[PDB]
Design an enzyme around this catalytic site. Structure first.
Site, PDB file in Angstrom:
ATOM      1  N   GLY A  13      -5.812  -6.537  -2.629  1.00 43.78           N
ATOM      2  CA  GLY A  13      -5.707  -8.117  -2.254  1.00 43.78           C
ATOM      3  C   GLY A  13      -6.178  -8.801  -2.951  1.00 43.78           C
TER       4      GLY A  13
ATOM      5  N   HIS B  36       0.629  -1.254  -0.321  1.00 44.47           N
ATOM      6  CA  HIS B  36       0.095   0.250   0.304  1.00 44.47           C
ATOM      7  C   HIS B  36       0.721   1.441   0.133  1.00 44.47           C
ATOM      8  CE1 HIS B  36      -2.722  -2.930   1.201  1.00 44.47           C
ATOM      9  NE2 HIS B  36      -2.068  -3.289   1.916  1.00 44.47           N
TER      10      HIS B  36
END
EC number: 2.-.-.-
Lengths: 309, 310
Positions: B121, B69
């Protein structure tokens, strides 16, 4: 440089709690999305951080009680209330029967009295002179969001709290021990101060002044979405509550369910700032010496787009 | 004028308050920030996907996020930098329960509802499919936020992405609640599936807005000193530290959270140092996932850490 973000930060007055349902539900049901808003909902670890963050513009919008909103701007952090969430919830000094504390304020002499952040202590200190006491006749203990917990644990003797949150915790905890839930009692602060309402603890929607002046449509659209979620929650409490808990599972407990049922009657239906409530708390604030003599209440109803009740 | 400034520095967690956040809270509770003349306003996201944009845009000063991230944020024009490491390489994978038709074979995931947290994800699982004779259309990805393990247990997804010391412990405990074998809580490790070797793609990091760093280098160094002080105490006094944390955050007093803390304990970075090799491997992985451009440079620094790399 950096990319722009349209995420509007919204900081709760407290850790996620039952009465925050209209905010979360507005997000969950896609009401914010329907207004082309992206709301980043944030939770404070310390409620005393909230008004400085919003007022300084480090956070765009949030919640806080009325007395805090008043004091924030008097202290040079320009916030404005743009609406009401929880109206006049009963607020007071919660205690357990059999601790020696009675309905007589004087029974507090030498007691450890918990408060949340700062203003609770100021309020109790001021009350003392009204009952032949001084601020040294008791020990104020700063407890953050754990006042009820510490009363139950015995580390304080009583504490400031709201009926629909703290008193419910006490009641449910007594029950679990096989004790009478009626042992959970409260010296109402509005009674003690002789006010007439606990309007000082009306939880309000607030926003930074510059954010307001620079995003007038966003503010108005935000309140449309809140209003839509508030209307929905009031008409379908059971279903809304279940929606809320599916997203924030802490709300699925029996304890939070009880709290929500107690919060339900206090929800503002119209979101309007009640003028008389602000006038009375403004005068209370001056009495407490936390607001200057000629202070003007920092609120507005102009971003609400439905008739004032 | 009357408009006053604030000294408060906003710090935004990567997740709702959880056991591995102890060094942040403890530094505040034991007065380590105050000793450094820092007033840190700790904030908790209701949605983890909000975090990097808030820090990157400068709306929030500092916070936490995982490596992937963090790399992605700055690649997308939200300039943040990792300034230290909190949770090193925690085992991350597709969690499932034995008996539901899912096995160690990736192909058993065909047609299944696979929960993911926020965004990346799904990107990761999508890329994986082509290595296993599958496409992103051969499963149904479901966005779950912070409730992946919950929804596995409630059956509204068949499996989902999570970290071993949080989500998998959650499944294990619920299984015991049901009178089942807790060993039925399993995962397909995503590092193994992606041929990575380590789960450094989910190393959780201390991050800061680039402008905040350039304009407040001393505050950053002091913040990390206070964090390091809390981290040393916690690792040396885990039981006492944990109890201090729970006394402040009562949710941390549960048996479930205590078991999560015990499992997180092995993963805490002791020195807070960014590990250069890990960043290199995850950089290349992110290029491979097409979330990072081909010439991308890892966004971290160890220069605000005030003790030697051991």
């Amino acid at each position: 440089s950096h990319m722009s973000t349209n995420k509007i930060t919204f900081l709760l007055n407290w850790e996620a709690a039952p009465y925050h349902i209209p905010v979360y539900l507005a997000n969950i049901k896609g009401y914010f999305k329907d207004e082309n808003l992206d709301i980043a909902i944030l939770e404070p670890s310390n409620p005393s951080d909230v008004t400085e963050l919003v007022g300084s513009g480090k956070v765009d919008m949030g919640l806080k009680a009325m007395v805090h909103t008043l004091a924030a701007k008097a202290r040079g952090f320009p916030v404005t209330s743009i609406g009401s969430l929880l109206d006049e919830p009963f607020t007071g000094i919660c205690y357990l029967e059999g601790s020696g504390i009675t309905s007589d304020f004087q029974s507090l002499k030498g007691k450890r009295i918990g408060y949340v952040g700062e203003f609770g202590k100021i309020q109790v200190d001021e009350l003392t002179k009204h009952y032949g006491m001084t601020p040294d006749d008791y020990v104020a203990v700063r407890c953050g969001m754990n006042v009820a917990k510490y009363i139950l644990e015995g580390t304080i003797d009583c504490g400031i709290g709201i009926e629909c949150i703290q008193q419910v915790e006490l009641e449910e905890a007594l029950k679990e021990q096989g004790k009478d839930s009626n042992d959970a009692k409260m010296l109402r602060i509005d009674k003690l101060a002789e006010l007439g309402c606990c309007c000082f603890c009306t939880i309000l929607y607030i926003a930074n002044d510059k954010f307001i002046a620079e995003n007038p449509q966003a503010v108005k659209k935000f309140l449309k979405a809140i209003k839509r979620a508030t209307d929905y929650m009031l008409a379908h409490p059971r279903e809304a509550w279940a929606e809320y808990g599916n997203f924030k599972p802490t709300m699925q407990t029996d304890l939070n369910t009880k709290k929500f049922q107690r919060c339900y009657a206090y929800f503002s239906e119209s979101l309007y700032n009640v003028h008389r409530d602000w006038r009375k708390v403004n005068n209370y604030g001056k009495r407490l010496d936390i607001l200057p003599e000629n202070y003007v209440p920092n609120y507005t109803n102009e971003y609400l787009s439905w008739p004032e009740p």
